[PDB]
Amino acid sequence: SNTGKPISDEKLHLISGKISNKKLPIINSNHDVTWIKTKAMTILGEDGKEIPEFKNKFGYSYIISPVKMDGKYSYYASLLILFETTKNGDDEYEIEDVKFVTAGSTLELKNSLLAVENSQEEGYVTAYPFGILMSDEIKNAFKLHWNYMLADLTVKNKLTQETKIYKISLNSKLIIEFLKEVLKENSILKDIAGDLFE
Amino acid sequence: TGKPISDEKLHLISGKISNKKLPIINSNHDVTWIKTKAMTILGEDGKEIPEFKNKFGYSYIISPVKMDGKYSYYASLLILFETTKNGDDEYEIEDVKFVTAGSTLELKNSLLAVENSQEEGYVTAYPFGILMSDEIKNAFKLTYKNGHWNYMLADLTVKNKLTQETKIYKISLNSKLIIEFLKEVLKENSILKDIAGDLFEDI
């Protein structure tokens, strides 16, 4: 309406509202982002042994991104689980979802704001990510000395068009290790990030 | 090569992604907000800067409060500078830096887009602050001394689009009001204590 007139009384005057059906007010500009990460390790069942179907077809890894953003340690530093395809894998397997069985089975890991990534790692094609941004949540579920973490992995087959659920085990030690090392190197993260590193 | 570990020992690998987009899906959403009505810009002396009178004001906002109809853990405290219909063609707010406390915080956020103002009579909202952080609140808390609230002195970078000149103005932001504002938002949305990280730990 008519030009607004800023209030000068220094009293609290609240207004509220809803922005219906619109992109988040996020700018889609170029960034330099750093990342530290583990290498694709084989796909294991509940028994702790290799699913003979997912043999160098795709692996799994843990990742901190962004470590830095435009050459300054980022407030938005986060932790995720990738499933990374290989040459003969990629055109066969699409990873849809990971849910924790052992602890943190509540947790929604399938993240609507996270794009399918290209694998950074040499010889890998696609990287299906999963996890919760600027959150200290996923380390906890794994903590619960350290034994295999059970989880259900939804995996689609491009050749068959059949989406199947596989009983898999994700190593738990490595992640609390990985968090200390990364802290060891990058000790602003204890303060600048959340309790991800506390 | 393209063959997964299969040995269960640690094996880090690292990289830099240079000059690319963030791997982020941004489709349509519903978003809820609450903010102060925009407030008069004050100089170092706590009095209105005549030049900005009815040109733009400043406000405190929590957004998003709900995303797609559900309380969100992305709830963040931002400072907006919002232009009036009469001020919008001349004034574009570029940056704000705290001076009294939190002087090392980068408040120009490379993720935040310029927004339309949601307040009647305002056009453009220039956002500043840190998503999912208690840092703006902690900076303002540091202005309470000897039982009393003092202003946050800050440097405000304002571009005059008519003259195409940019200048920095000493301003005072009201510290007491950001605490009162966080108190009212929590009272009406107690669940923000649980999912908005440390912002509300303190209240």
Automatic annotation (TrEMBL), chain B:
Lineage: Bacteria, Pseudomonadati, Spirochaetota, Spirochaetia, Spirochaetales
Protein's recorded name: S2 lipoprotein
NCBIfam families: S2_P23
Annotated keywords: Lipoprotein
Outer surface lipoprotein BB0158 domain ranges (all copies): 14-190
Keyword Lipoprotein: yes
